[PDB]
Design a protein around this ligand. Structure first.
Ligand SMILES: CCCCCCCCCCCCCCCCCC(=O)OC[C@H](COP(=O)([O-])OCC[N+](C)(C)C)OC(=O)CCCCCCCCCCCCCCCCC
Ligand SMILES: CCCCCCCCCCCCCCCCCC(=O)OC[C@H](COP(=O)([O-])OCC[N+](C)(C)C)OC(=O)CCCCCCCCCCCCCCCCC
Ligand SMILES: CCCCCCCCCCCCCCCCCC(=O)OC[C@H](COP(=O)(O)OCCN)OC(=O)CCCCCCCCCCCCCCCCC
Ligand SMILES: CCCCCCCCCCCCCCCCCC(=O)OC[C@H](COP(=O)(O)OCCN)OC(=O)CCCCCCCCCCCCCCCCC
Ligand SMILES: CCCCCCCCCCCCCCCCCC(=O)OC[C@H](COP(=O)(O)OCCN)OC(=O)CCCCCCCCCCCCCCCCC
Ligand code: HEM
Ligand code: HEM
Lengths: 58, 48, 102, 57, 52, 49, 379, 87
């Protein structure tokens, strides 16, 4: 009834459920990783990219 | 000369973060599937 | 030859480094037809000892380890077990070659 | 003659008299016990899995 | 000429392999909508609707 | 107790005790065609379930 | 019953990659071989996506490459990974040959000879691919090295007129170089199949050089995941070399259009040819320089008959280890000298470097082998 | 250390009104108490590296965990009362 036993049992034990876990995690990882890397890139280049100066020239 | 410069650097940042995630995990898989062999002990039984 | 050649032989035996894998000298010889025939002519005890030492060395070189220093093969205790068999095989091959010459 | 405990199911199965009631053979003298050598000096401990620590106590 | 599999045992095998084949089909559909970035299903999901 | 056994609980019990489990392998004889522990362990589950 | 051992197509894959016995102690260097195959596929795949937009014409080759970089979606990515993948291909190739030399892998003579055929083919493929973008350096490097290939009396001038398809390098040379550059990686792939086939009759070598039949493991899952990890490390190095330093290994003079009347102050090939270039100009005779380049690349073929020790690997030969590392150092010096202009003191350094290179491979290593044989009390 | 950083980079001092006085005084005693807790954890860590805590009689880390949970619930009260609500 412990959490790692049930996490193995209903997610990792079956191979089709393993693949479903991998696919859903891939989609959510794509969204979160794209947001994180885009935010890091726009912070490192604060005021330099076009979207930071796009509002001045409407 | 390089209109792709900023997009290249963004893709490189994503590459660096993804590789820094992926390398210890793949190394861990190698260490698992090879740690079945690297802890192996051999013995010898000569009959004399 | 008296003073340092034996000392240089001991130092070179330490420096070459097959003693710290537990190997003897004749285990390190690369196989030819002559060496394979000499190995085939070995008795069962020396053959089994050789093959265990070889796979122990392969185990040690897998993990990038060496034997402890007390288990290093000593220079004086290193026996040349194979080379009479190898010399006999080389001699009979030379006899066959010189007969094929004439 | 009749029953010998065997057969991997832990059962008193049926077996011949020469092995059920004479389990020790007719060989006269035990010959040797060849010892086991290892590659590295291993700590082959039967009881309590050698020692458990992480430093000097 | 597929009359060799008309019996209760193959029906038993079939009802054993309904959920695994259905879950593999679910994996295939989710992977297809994930790889193609298909707009029919990806607009029905909360968190992935961020770039639209 | 034998009459209680049907197919569903039998394959549930067999999946509980066999599926995705690490075996103990002992061998004696000419056993180099006997595979390593990784292939024997990988054979204890199906990729299709 | 099972398809892995009875199906005639899966039997080949099982015999070559799944139940293949491999030595249990091979280091990371062996991964380089599989990396080479991966690079080949990468190059081929990226090459195909350069071929969907490249126009082999002297008016519209440079312009087509700029259109690939500036207007094709992610075309800059594909072009620069093709270039840096050629560089990574040569890095992995050099370390593959160095592994072959150090651990005595040239005793597989058929595998070694199919290897040096593969090396010749990939050098010619990289040459014609570098001619393909039709910049200043492409045109002038092609003209220089083909004109010195013309040095053979009574034969070389007809051969260079036949190779050029005209009086000098022109549109016919560019188009036939495009056809040859496209088609040579498939002969390379078939020769790699023959390379692997000639290897698998005897099995791989191990760093100790001993008979590994006492302890061998299947290729799956061990070396499968080991080569996967090597592929990931290689892709780190390659994508760092594309996404961060896309023209550190390149040459800026290739970014002007090919002006046939603009001779550059320096003319160089790419770096992976440069050592042979420094063996080329180390002799002040054109026949001598070209033939010395041929011997400097075919001394690898001569190598299996220059083995004198009763051992195989250099793991238990310290003097020959020292001579090998002096050889690698000399090769590095030759690369630097071939990068350098033909002035003082580079001419004497290059001459001594080539002399020491041929002396170390030809003379000094069998002498060191027989010295170590006498030193180990067996001769 | 990053509480010292927000002490360095705040817009007001302890003499800057009753809000500054209350906030800095409460956070100052919280910082003092978490320094005491960190020192107590350092002491029990150095005791455990010398093999002192057994499997049952390990009251030093029990007191450390109780003081640390106290510091945690007090910081939750400062987060609600001073930071989130009322500001
Ligand atoms: C490269 C890293 C992955 C290498 C392959 C691998 O380990 O696969 C995991 C495993 C094998 O690795 P394994 O040896 O760890 O096995 C896992 C064992 N079970 C299944 C019991 C948990 O392979 C699979 O699960 C099948 C491949 C498909 C994975 C899912 C893909 C979903 C997205 C589709 C679009
Ligand atoms: C007495 C009442 C007690 C209970 C009260 C319950 C409610 C209290 C208030 C809760 C927080 C309310 C605001 C939260 C949302 C802020 C939204 C916002 O401004 O977003 C834009 C800002 C700025 O956007 P951004 O683009 O800079 O964010 C970076 C985005 N990524 C991560 C993708 C790179 O984003 C945030 O503020 C995000 C906050 C994320 C962290 C949240 C907490 C994480 C878990 C911490 C505890 C872990 C324990 C283990
Ligand atoms: C640089 C790295 C140097 C290095 O790591 O050297 C050590 C290693 C030799 O180690 P080894 O004797 O195998 O013993 C194992 C435990 N030390 O060295 C090696 O394993 C090096 C073996 C050779 C691989 C490197 C090849 C370098 C490039 C060679 C170019 C020339 C090839 C021919 C060209 C024509
Ligand atoms: C007798 C030596 C005793 C050494 C003792 C060292 C300290 C021992 C106690 C501490 C332990 C240190 C680590 C031990 C390492 C292994 C043992 C060892 O020291 O080996 C010495 C090593 C190999 O030994 P060996 O092969 O016998 O040496 C022959 C010398 N040529 O040999 C060496 O290290 C010497 C290597 C010399 C290499 C010189 C190369 C000069 C030429 C380079 C040219 C490059 C190209 C230049 C360009 C050419 C064109 C212009
Ligand atoms: C503010 C001052 C007061 C802070 C709180 C003090 C709390 C003391 C609680 C009781 C400690 C005590 O006596 O615990 C019992 C324990 C012995 O039992 P135990 O070790 O479990 O059993 C033997 C195991 N083989 O005995 C011990 O563990 C003895 C050691 C516990 C005390 C450690 C003191 C750490 C002090 C940290 C703050 C220092 C203040 C000055 C420096 C910072 C200034 C900003
Ligand atoms: C076209 C590039 C090449 C490819 C794709 C290639 C491919 C391979 C592959 C897949 C292997 C087996 C894996 C391994 O053991 O590393 C291998 C091994 C080998 N290759 Fe190559 N190779 C190439 C170039 C060469 C060259 C130029 C040589 C000769 C100098 C060579 C000689 C060898 C040898 C001797 C082995 C045996 C390894 C051993 O047992 O030690 N290869 N190659
Ligand atoms: C069949 C596979 C291949 C095809 C179709 C192909 C095609 C091309 C094309 C069209 C170009 C010119 C486009 C450009 O320069 O960006 C090119 C350039 C090049 N190719 Fe290939 N190629 C292939 C394989 C290879 C291989 C295996 C190598 C490595 C030996 C290689 C090395 C190069 C190099 C070095 C360049 C020049 C890059 C530069 O512009 O600096 N190619 N290739």
């Amino acid at each position: 009834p412990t959490i790692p036993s049930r996490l193995y049992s209903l997610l990792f034990r079956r191979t089709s459920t393993f693949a479903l876990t991998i696919a859903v995690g891939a989609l959510f990882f794509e969204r979160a990783f794209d947001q994180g890397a885009d935010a890091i890139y726009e912070h490192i280049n604060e005021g330099k990219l076009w979207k930071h100066i796009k509002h001045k020239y409407e | 000369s390089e209109p792709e410069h900023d997009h290249r650097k963004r893709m490189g940042l994503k590459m660096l973060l993804m590789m820094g995630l992926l390398l210890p995990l793949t190394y861990a898989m190698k260490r698992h599937k090879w740690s079945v062999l690297k802890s192996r002990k051999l013995a010898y039984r000569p009959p004399k | 030859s008296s003073k340092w050649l034996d000392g240089f032989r001991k130092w070179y035996y330490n420096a070459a480094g097959f003693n710290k894998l537990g190997l003897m000298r004749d285990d390190t010889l690369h196989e030819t037809e002559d060496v394979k025939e000499a190995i085939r002519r070995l008795p069962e005890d020396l053959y089994n000892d050789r093959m265990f030492r070889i796979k122990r060395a392969l185990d040690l070189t897998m993990r990038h380890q060496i034997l402890p220093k007390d288990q290093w093969t000593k220079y004086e205790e290193d026996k040349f077990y194979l080379e009479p068999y190898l010399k006999e095989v080389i001699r009979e091959r030379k006899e066959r070659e010189e007969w094929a010459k004439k | 003659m009749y029953y010998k405990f065997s057969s991997f199911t832990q059962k008193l199965a049926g077996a011949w008299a020469s092995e059920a009631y004479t389990p020790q053979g007719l060989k006269p003298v035990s010959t040797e016990a060849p010892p086991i050598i290892f590659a590295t000096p291993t700590k082959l401990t039967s009881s309590v899995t050698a020692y458990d620590y992480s430093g000097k106590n | 000429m597929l009359s060799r599999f008309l019996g209760p045992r193959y029906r038993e095998l079939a009802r054993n392999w309904i959920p695994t084949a259905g879950m593999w089909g679910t994996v295939g559909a989710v992977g297809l909508v994930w790889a193609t970035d298909w707009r029919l299903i990806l607009d029905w999901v909360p968190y992935i609707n961020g770039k639209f | 107790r034998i009459q209680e056994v049907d197919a569903q609980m039998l394959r549930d019990i067999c999946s509980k005790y066999f599926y995705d489990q690490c075996p103990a392998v002992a061998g004696y004889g000419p056993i180099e065609q006997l595979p390593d522990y990784n292939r024997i362990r990988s054979g204890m589950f199906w990729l299709r379930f | 019953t099972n398809m892995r051992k009875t199906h005639p197509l899966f039997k080949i894959i099982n015999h070559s990659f799944i139940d293949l016995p491999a030595p249990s102690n091979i280091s990371s260097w062996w991964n380089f071989g599989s990396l080479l195959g991966v690079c080949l596929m990468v190059q081929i795949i990226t090459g195909l996506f350069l071929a969907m937009h490249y126009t082999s014409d002297t008016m519209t080759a440079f312009s087509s490459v700029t259109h690939i970089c500036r207007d094709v979606n992610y075309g800059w990515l594909i072009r620069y990974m093709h270039a840096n993948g050629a560089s990574m291909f040569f890095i992995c190739l050099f370390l593959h040959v160095g592994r072959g030399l150090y651990y005595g892998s040239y005793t597989f003579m058929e595998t070694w000879n199919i290897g040096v055929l593969l090396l010749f083919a990939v050098m010619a493929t990289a040459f014609m691919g570098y001619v393909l973008p039709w910049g200043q350096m492409s045109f002038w490097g092609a003209t220089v090295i083909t004109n010195l290939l013309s040095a053979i009396p009574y034969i070389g001038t007809t051969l260079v007129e036949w190779i050029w398809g005209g009086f000098s390098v022109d549109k016919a040379t560019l188009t036939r170089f495009f056809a040859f550059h496209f088609i040579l990686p498939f002969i390379i792939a078939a020769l790699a199949i023959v390379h692997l086939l000639f290897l698998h009759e005897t099995g791989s070598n191990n760093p100790t050089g001993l008979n590994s039949d006492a302890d061998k493991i299947p290729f799956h899952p061990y070396y499968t995941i080991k080569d996967i990890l090597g592929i990931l490390i290689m892709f780190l190095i390659l994508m760092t070399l594309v996404l961060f330093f896309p023209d550190m290994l390149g040459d800026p003079d290739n970014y002007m259009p090919a002006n046939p009347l603009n001779t550059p102050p320096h003319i160089k090939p790419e770096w992976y040819f440069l050592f042979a270039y420094a063996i080329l100009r180390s002799i002040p005779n054109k026949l001598g320089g070209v033939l010395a380049l041929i011997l400097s690349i075919l001394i690898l073929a001569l190598m299996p008959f220059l083995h004198t020790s009763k051992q195989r690997s250099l793991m238990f030969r310290p003097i020959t280890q020292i001579l090998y590392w002096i050889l690698v150092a000399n090769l590095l010096i030759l690369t630097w000298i071939g990068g350098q202009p033909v002035e003082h003191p580079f001419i004497i350094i290059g001459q001594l470097a080539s002399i020491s290179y041929f002396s170390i491979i030809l003379i000094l290593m069998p002498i060191s082998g027989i010295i170590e044989d006498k030193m180990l009390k067996l001769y | 250390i990053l509480q010292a950083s927000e002490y360095f980079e705040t817009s007001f001092s302890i003499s800057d009104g009753i809000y500054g006085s209350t906030f800095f005084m409460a956070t100052g005693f919280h910082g003092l108490h978490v320094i005491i807790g960190s020192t107590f954890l350092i002491v029990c860590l150095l005791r455990q590296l010398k093999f002192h805590f057994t499997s049952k009689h390990h009251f030093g880390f029990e007191a450390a965990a109780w003081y640390w949970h106290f510091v945690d619930v007090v910081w939750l009260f400062l987060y609600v009362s001073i930071y989130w609500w009322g500001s």
